[PDB]
Design a protein around this ligand. Structure first.
Ligand SMILES: *[C@@H]1O[C@H](CO)[C@@H](O[C@@H]2O[C@H](CO)[C@@H](O[C@@H]3O[C@H](CO[C@H]4O[C@H](CO[C@H]5O[C@H](CO)[C@@H](O)[C@H](O)[C@@H]5O[C@H]5O[C@H](CO)[C@@H](O)[C@H](O)[C@@H]5O)[C@@H](O)[C@H](O[C@H]5O[C@H](CO)[C@@H](O)[C@H](O)[C@@H]5O)[C@@H]4O)[C@@H](O)[C@H](O[C@H]4O[C@H](CO)[C@@H](O)[C@H](O)[C@@H]4O[C@H]4O[C@H](CO)[C@@H](O)[C@H](O)[C@@H]4O[C@H]4O[C@H](CO)[C@@H](O)[C@H](O)[C@@H]4O)[C@@H]3O)[C@H](O)[C@H]2NC(C)=O)[C@H](O)[C@H]1NC(C)=O
Ligand SMILES: *[C@@H]1O[C@H](CO)[C@@H](O[C@@H]2O[C@H](CO)[C@@H](O)[C@H](O)[C@H]2NC(C)=O)[C@H](O)[C@H]1NC(C)=O
Ligand SMILES: *[C@@H]1O[C@H](CO)[C@@H](O[C@@H]2O[C@H](CO)[C@@H](O)[C@H](O)[C@H]2NC(C)=O)[C@H](O)[C@H]1NC(C)=O
Ligand code: NAG
Ligand code: NAG
Ligand code: NAG
Ligand code: NAG
Ligand code: NAG
Ligand code: NAG
Ligand code: NAG
Ligand code: NAG
Ligand code: NAG
Ligand code: NAG
Ligand code: NAG
Ligand code: NAG
Lengths: 293, 211, 227
């Protein structure tokens, strides 16, 4: 690819075979820097790793309530106890044919559109005294998150084969802006304080929040409108607790989302036309503990 | 820069469209520059104007992207004939050192007046200095386009005469000069000298003799 | 309020520093932006450059390697020094006050704004002519009338370079005054002609004198007018 810049995503061009196998065209399109690597001439990030299949531009990524049922002659057992920590014996048990409405929200660092808790916020872990064990927090009152890609991008259809139509990003109409999110400084402060509360019921000492130790794990990554954001969440967890204002993160965007198994294939999220803006409830959280603090 | 012509009628509403439409959010400036004269800031922010500009100078804002920038001049007058520059500032394009192309406004259908020709003979001093000069003066005509004809007695001259290109005035009419350089003997050997100024379709005559 | 006035040689030779200055009236020199703009015949307006209240330099890249816009805050004076001038540089030079605007379209923190500049008050204009030809003073020859109303004037013959100023009775007589545009004669010198329409009663005798001034020649002359 022969890539330029804009001001970030590149502006590339490339010879590609067409619907006729011996006729060559040179198309242009934009590719986020994460979706390309230098060899200036460029290429796609995966070409030395795995096959990539463009997701059909008609299947949606919408988290839908999935109800898990056990076969006839089996049973699923609930636990209605409004303070039930991870494991142990539950005293308010009930039986159900199917689970409630589950949304397969494939998220990272901040759980989205999940099931809240009743009464107070709970925190779960296996051996909380073992630091190499994740901590799954559950909030009792969602704190609003609002994300958007304000760029008014376009979608160009590129015929590179009989019926094989690749959808690329044409250009940006209007202002070039930044993909980001928003949460309330007040609501995330009192909610961070609630999380600080029960970080003492299993500890003593002082609580410190700090940034994360490919970028999928380092940032709040999720799906908004159909494009995968990667919001640098350092403006979220950088506070030490003894005993208006919108928090906005800097989200990048990716179109090539590899898989998590062991060197196989990848995907290409086709571009979304117009602007994108979604609103979600961050109801969970995945922490990780690592002197005197 | 090159010129872009425009013609509105006196009392109408001009719609001067910018020649370099914006790609992003814009902050467009409008300058009224009369040739050989200080420019006048018409509109700085996309619609904001300075102190001392009539309300009839309206500039379109950029609330919803897509609406191009157009300068609107309602109730055009005579003095509104000038150049207009579109200084475009948008997020995408870089630094706009260059003003607009230009849009010269020419108001049509204005009251046609006739010139006031005034011819002065050669001065006493310069005649003693061995040189002559007839100064055919023209002022307050419209439209500003005249042809000057010099007659030595009854015969035309054409040799040794300069003439100004018509220039505008404060009262929006035009004015131009016309100098005929004679030798001091030619000026005396002739009985009379005339100056024919043919404005529109009428010629005016102002003659002088050496007495 | 604030006004401006330039003052330059009016004529500079090729391959030389076209110096210039501009003093402001009624406003501080170090709390605004100042721009310089020229306009040749046949071309449009051209933005030279501009200096900030921080004394920051930024010139039009067209001629960036030539210009240098200085400023001395002891007075309200700031200069401009073009060099290696050529014939295409003959233009009227203006002195205007620029002001800074911040056009915000997204988030002020990510950098989603741009800075635009607008000139709201302008100087009057200093004509500049570049040519190896030497400077020349004019010569005034009166023009007398010959009787209700009548007209008289002064012929400013063969000068170089533009412009000349012509008052009447040092500035007293200002009604009916009508100075005419010059005439570039083939000899390379301009020619002006002022004229004043005067009541026929004042012919005898309300003294009339035209005050001619040509800056590139350090000349100031007067001349009576009478039949
Ligand atoms: C997620 O979280 C994010 C982070 O928290 C959050 O980010 C925010 O995003 C939004 C949108 O994405 C951003 O909103 C924009 O804000 C811009 C800035 O607006 C501010 O500043 C202007 C100008 O301020 C100067 O001028 C005023 C007077 O005019 C002075 O009083 C000021 O002191 C100041 O002057 C000093 O500073 C200048 C520097 O700029 C110096 O140059 C100067 O010398 C002085 O020193 C103010 O007018 C604004 O006031 C408005 O807001 C207050 C509350 O504070 C309200 O009372 C009221 O509603 C006011 O209107 C504000 O303070 C805006 O420019 C921008 O809106 C313009 O642009 C868009 C597109 O770009 C247009 O569609 C829109 O119509 C606006 O255009 C108008 O204005 C421009 C410029 O003036 C004109 O050129 C244009 O023609 C048009 O004019 C028309 O409308 C005018 C009214 O707007 C009217 O006056 C005209 O007559 C004409 O009709 C947009 O609103 C926001 O900045 C982000 N926040 C941050 C912190 O970055 C995000 O929202 C969250 N949510 C998400 C992402 O979902
Ligand atoms: C991306 O680059 C392409 C070129 O590969 C640009 O397309 C050209 O744009 C110019 C104007 O900027 C036109 O004059 C050309 O005709 C265009 N060429 C083709 C083949 O379309 C495109 O504008 C660039 N877009 C961005 C957002 O940078
Ligand atoms: C969390 O749930 C909300 C509400 O269902 C989702 O917002 C929807 O987003 C889709 C596509 O982005 C739109 O078609 C719907 O209209 C939206 N619903 C509402 C009520 O606005 C949001 O996308 C979900 N978040 C995640 C990460 O899946
Ligand atoms: C496409 O092939 C031609 C062959 O001459 C080459 O010149 C051109 O650079 C190629 N395009 C790209 C984007 O490499
Ligand atoms: C592919 O190339 C990238 C260069 O960006 C490199 O980091 C990666 O290790 C390479 N993978 C393989 C399997 O060669
Ligand atoms: C069991 O839990 C449900 C919901 O959490 C509650 O409504 C009910 O009162 C509880 N019953 C007992 C016996 O704890
Ligand atoms: C987000 O806010 C409240 C729950 O506190 C609710 O009105 C809304 O449905 C929530 N959205 C979800 C759960 O997707
Ligand atoms: C949950 O409570 C039981 C006792 O009711 C306890 O044994 C278990 O360790 C608790 N789980 C955690 C993660 O603390
Ligand atoms: C938890 O981990 C610590 C060491 O990190 C270990 O000593 C302890 O036995 C573990 N407890 C349980 C219940 O696994
Ligand atoms: C986005 O761009 C399209 C042009 O392709 C335009 O029709 C539409 O109004 C724009 N929308 C926004 C919100 O800018
Ligand atoms: C998020 O957006 C929703 C709807 O636009 C709004 O009700 C809520 O207050 C917003 N919250 C934050 C933190 O931006
Ligand atoms: C966060 O981690 C960095 C990396 O070592 C460290 O320098 C910093 O002190 C930490 N911040 C807090 C508040 O613990
Ligand atoms: C996240 O943002 C902080 C500043 O807000 C910056 O220092 C840090 O490098 C960013 N993290 C990444 C992974 O870019
Ligand atoms: C942590 O990051 C946030 C970003 O919103 C910032 O407001 C806060 O000052 C930072 N904490 C520091 C610098 O101690
Ligand atoms: C926070 O974001 C919401 C989302 O639209 C917006 O309405 C509100 O004005 C923002 N508040 C601040 C202080 O930026």
């Amino acid at each position: 690819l022969n890539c330029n810049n804009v001001n970030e995503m590149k502006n590339c061009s490339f010879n590609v075979t067409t619907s006729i196998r011996d006729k060559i065209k040179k198309e242009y399109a934009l590719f986020y820097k994460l979706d390309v690597v230098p060899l200036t001439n460029y290429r796609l990030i995966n070409c030395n790793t795995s096959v990539i299949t463009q997701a059909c531009p008609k299947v949606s990524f919408e988290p839908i309530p999935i109800h898990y049922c056990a076969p006839a002659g089996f049973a699923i057992l609930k636990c209605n106890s409004k303070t039930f920590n991870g494991s142990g014996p539950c005293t308010n048990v009930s039986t159900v044919q199917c689970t409630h409405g589950i949304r397969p929200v494939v998220s990272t660092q901040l759980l989205l559109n999940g099931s809240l808790a009743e009464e107070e916020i709970v925190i779960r872990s296996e051996n909380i005294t073992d630091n190499a064990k994740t901590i799954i927090v559950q909030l009792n009152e969602a704190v609003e998150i609002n994300c958007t890609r304000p760029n008014n991008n376009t979608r160009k259809s590129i015929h590179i084969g009989p019926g094989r139509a690749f959808y690329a990003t044409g250009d940006i109409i209007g202002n070039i802006r930044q993909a980001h999110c928003n949460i309330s400084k007040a609501r995330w402060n009192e909610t961070l304080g609630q999380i600080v509360a029960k970080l003492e019921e299993q500890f003593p000492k002082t609580i410190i929040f700090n940034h994360s130790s490919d970028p999928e794990i380092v940032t709040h990554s999720f799906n908004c409108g159909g494009e995968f954001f990667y919001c640098n969440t350092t403006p979220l967890f950088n506070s030490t607790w003894n005993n208006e204002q919108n928090i906005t993160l800097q989200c990048r965007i990716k179109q090539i989302i590899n898989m998590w198994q062991g060197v196989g294939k990848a995907m290409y999220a086709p571009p979304i036309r117009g602007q994108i803006r979604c609103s979600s409830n961050i109801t969970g959280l995945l922490l990780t503990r690592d002197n005197g603090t | 820069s090159y010129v872009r012509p425009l013609s509105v009628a006196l009392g109408e509403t001009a719609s001067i469209s910018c020649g370099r439409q914006a790609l992003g959010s814009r902050a467009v400036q409008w300058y009224q520059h009369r040739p050989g004269q200080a420019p006048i800031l018409l509109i700085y922010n996309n619609q904001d104007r300075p102190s001392g500009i009539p309300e009839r100078f309206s500039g379109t804002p950029d609330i919803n992207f897509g609406t191009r920038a157009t300068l609107t001049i309602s109730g055009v007058e005579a003095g509104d004939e000038a150049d207009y520059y579109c200084h475009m500032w948008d997020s995408r394009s870089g630094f706009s050192w260059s003003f607009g192309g230009a849009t010269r406004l020419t108001v049509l259908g204005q009251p046609k007046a006739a010139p006031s020709v005034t011819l002065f003979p050669p001065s006493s001093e310069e005649l003693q200095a061995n040189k002559a000069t007839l100064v055919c003066l023209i002022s307050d005509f419209y439209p500003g386009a005249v042809t000057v004809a010099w007659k030595a007695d009854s015969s035309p001259v054409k040799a040794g005469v300069e003439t100004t290109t018509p220039s505008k005035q404060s009262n929006n009419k035009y004015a131009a000069s016309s100098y005929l350089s004679l030798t001091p003997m030619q000026w005396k050997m002739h009985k009379s000298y005339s100056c024919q100024v043919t404005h529109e379709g009428s010629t005016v005559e102002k003659t002088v003799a050496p007495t | 309020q604030v006004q401006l006035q330039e003052s330059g040689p009016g004529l500079v030779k090729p391959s030389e520093t076209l110096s210039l200055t501009c003093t402001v009236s009624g406003g501080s020199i170090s709390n605004y932006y100042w721009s310089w703009i020229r306009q040749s015949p046949g071309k449009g307006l051209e933005w030279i450059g501009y200096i900030s209240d921080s004394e920051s330099t930024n010139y039009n890249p067209s001629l960036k390697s030539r210009v240098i816009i200085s400023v001395d805050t002891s007075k309200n004076q700031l200069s401009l020094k073009l060099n290696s001038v050529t014939a295409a540089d003959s233009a009227i030079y203006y002195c205007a006050r620029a002001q800074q605007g911040k056009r915000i379209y997204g988030m002020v923190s990510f950098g989603e704004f741009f800075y635009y500049y607008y000139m709201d008050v302008w100087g009057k204009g200093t004509t500049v002519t570049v040519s190896s030809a030497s400077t020349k003073g004019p010569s005034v020859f009166p023009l007398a009338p010959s009787s209700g109303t009548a007209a008289l004037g002064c012929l400013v013959k063969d000068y170089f370079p533009e412009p000349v100023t012509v008052s009447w009775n040092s500035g007293a007589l200002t009604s009916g005054v009508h100075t005419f545009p010059a005439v570039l004669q083939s000899s390379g010198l301009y020619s002006l002609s002022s004229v004043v329409t005067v009541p026929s009663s004042s012919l005898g005798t309300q003294t009339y004198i035209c005050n001619v001034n040509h800056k590139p020649s350090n000349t100031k002359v007067d001349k009576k007018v009478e039949p």
